[PDB]
Amino acid sequence: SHSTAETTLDSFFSRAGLVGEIDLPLEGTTNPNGYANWDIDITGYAQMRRKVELFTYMRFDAEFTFVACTPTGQVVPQLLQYMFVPPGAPEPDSRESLAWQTATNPSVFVKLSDPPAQVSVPFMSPASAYQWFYDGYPTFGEHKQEKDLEYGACPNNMMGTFSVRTVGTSKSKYPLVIRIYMRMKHVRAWIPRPMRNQNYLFKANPNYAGNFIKPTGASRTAITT
Amino acid sequence: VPQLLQYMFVPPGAPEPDSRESLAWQTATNPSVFVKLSDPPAQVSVPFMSPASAYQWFYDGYPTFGEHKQEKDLE
């Protein structure tokens, strides 16, 4: 229409929603080391995933934000860290790891009492556009018979990694609950792909299961209204 | 007190939340904002959402817009 701004592909992708959920309890077994990590899995949520396979070649940026709250929702005087891990850089392995003080890894000091801060990452893919389907082998190496260390994390598709840590030699005094939101500014796609409609079986692999359901069965017969 | 509260606008098409742990809270298409109440009060605005050209406080007809005029429709 004349006012078609709300109907464009940007508007069709203009929404900040739930992307990540990571918890850091004071004591427990989910993270007995005081820190956690999160891989960017857009395909994890079938809501946002089902959108992207409508096209095959697509480009998108993103911005990320962090929220710190207690199970009751109170605010406490502590700081938390966030840093982007490029594929070449190594992930942290311990709470006292040397990766925290690495200069080449961008990190920011943030006070959670300050209303939540938000950061953005530009286009990091070495290729021209993202490809959600790679019609070939997951690994880009010359070997096609072994279990290579580069399997799963290929330089041609991965788009980064985040880690969280509370810095300070003194022990943390409060429980933490962390929620993650993301949104895109520039989105551009080239070629449409038929929509994926049937039930999913795996979290990131389009393989499906032998029990067949149809998307609709409401209409009984042609003669029936 | 140090706590946060949520506010979101529900369009007529969207479904209302039913439980505290409902899946509607994390729905992306429903606009919601994270706000700290310690911050002096925040204010938000909504533009013209009526599908019609202007609002009508009196509808000289049936409350329901459906084709049935005898039952207790959900609408």
Added chain:
Amino acid sequence: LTIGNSTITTQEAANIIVGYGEWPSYCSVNRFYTLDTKLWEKSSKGWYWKFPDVLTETGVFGQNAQFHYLYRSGFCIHVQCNASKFHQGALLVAVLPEYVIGTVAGGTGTEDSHPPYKQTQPGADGFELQHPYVLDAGIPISQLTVCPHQWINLRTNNCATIIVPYINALPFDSALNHCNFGLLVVPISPLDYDQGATPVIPITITLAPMCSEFAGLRQ
């Protein structure tokens, strides 16, 4: 252009269809490839093909294309379906870019290792769809028409053509490393015929790429 005595009888009244109104491009020829005839049956569900890996065995320059790395050509694909005037049937031809083959993970435990070489190699003949409603990939068959395609009806036509340029995942593309595309043929209305008539419908597909590149590297 004959290999000894290869002078087939070809149609001169093809129905010209253009793709997006765009002819192919330069660097970013008269050999007509011949494939084995396909038999269409009443209970048949449709077939599929994968290029260029399977194409490197049928063509005269295709056989040499096994050793050629890059490509630079325009595709004129001819699909031919000859039938009598009193036969019944309907066929769909379409091209699905970046067509990822959907493996089937059955059994009591929903987990499998790296795809077996048996599934990866169906041969140069082609394979049959297990459940053609989802194209054996969980992708609904209702939505193929958004991609380039053509309608083939026995009452209407006997041949069709498709022209598609090179679309790849990278500006610098490898044909022997990256799977480009594939062709899908599936019946919509099952073929019917009178008792005693010919029960086999021939299908032939013809394509004519221009040329490929050798490449090569040393240490």
Added chain:
Amino acid sequence: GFPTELKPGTNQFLTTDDGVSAPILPNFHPTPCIHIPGEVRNLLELCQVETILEVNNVPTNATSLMERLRFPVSAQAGKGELCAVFRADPGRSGPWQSTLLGQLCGYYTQWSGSLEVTFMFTGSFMATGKMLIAYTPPGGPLPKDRATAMLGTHVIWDFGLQSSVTLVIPWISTTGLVSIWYQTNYVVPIGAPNTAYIIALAAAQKNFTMQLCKDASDIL
């Protein structure tokens, strides 16, 4: 420092905001943009593409999905009703959630415009007959026979044309009904198949558009 106090509500965080943030990498240079034959602009042109529609939904077996998307026709049935396509409302369940148009409209609340459909016939070259396309406006009662439907806007099928038969709905916004009826009996020459199957196509017109987004998701 400079004397100015922002009005209360400075740190409100709403998703709709047109905010720009400092890049995490202020020195990286993005990869050059290339030209790709594929290109997408809006949702309107994607609605302008043709896709098949389904009518029959009797069988439910896994190896039986195909005869759903098409409906049969036989010469024994005559002067009656073959198939009645369900009510015209793409957003709701029925015929249109199978095609691309309804599903994309599924991510929206209300829409307005005009819709058009085209029909294709898959009979033998030696076959002939007459067919009727019936459209009734919303509000009007259910059609009774070919005569009642013929009063309104109807399309008559000729087998001298293969698929030139098409219908255009002037307006859609409780819902309209369309049905197919037997104007004459089906006659077939001897030595030819006694039955055929029918398929149809649908798309969206130029003036069709959506207004407001909806947060709708079903699986998973």
Added chain:
Amino acid sequence: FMFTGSFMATGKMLIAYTPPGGPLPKDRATAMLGTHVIWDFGLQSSVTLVIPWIS
């Protein structure tokens, strides 16, 4: 070549020529590599072959 089928018939045919010296043909694929003529039944007898040289 001339064809004497019915007006309602259809099908596909192949004409194979191999140059002297070359081994015997095996199937349609091997012969298709060389100069071959493909027969179309949309044409009645337009199918013809020309041998560039014989000695």
Added chain:
Amino acid sequence: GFPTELKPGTNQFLTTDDGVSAPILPNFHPTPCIHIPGEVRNLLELCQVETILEVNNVPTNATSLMERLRFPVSAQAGKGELCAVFRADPGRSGPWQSTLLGQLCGYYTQWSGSLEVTFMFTGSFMATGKMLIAYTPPGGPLPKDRATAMLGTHVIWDFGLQSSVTLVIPWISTTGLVSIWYQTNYVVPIGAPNTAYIIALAAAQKNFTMQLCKDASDIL
């Protein structure tokens, strides 16, 4: 004071920021800038300088490092393979981490462009012979002999020229291989040393560049 509320995330502290701070000394005057013959602009021109490369790595003794950077040649070996330089990938360990080009690329993640190498010979003035330079493209199997390598892009060495022999790699981006083979036997006049030692040089071409920085450090 002036009515405007900044969006949340005002005090985020990221290292990449292009922020300017008030000087601690607002009255000091910096020392005048002088002209120095040395001058540096980017990392590209520093890659455009020549540096030696190493092949042999058999001995490890402290007083034995020098015979690593050069590899020997003898007249007894003929019609075979003298030395096979390791896979072409400057960032990873192998040949190139000894030279300046690989080490500076060590502070980066990915790179693209073309590479060139030049070879120098240190034989006697009275010596003669023939030599072969072999390059195989990535993907291709390992070379077998001089004949297989000769099919691809190869460089033939002539002793009528001292060091005019050079090789250029059109593209590098799993890794390529280069090797040296004996095209003919080594012949030497009587009264001359029976063996010699060989050295080589390497550099980067104009179109060679890096894209993204990496946080890599080894010692200490």
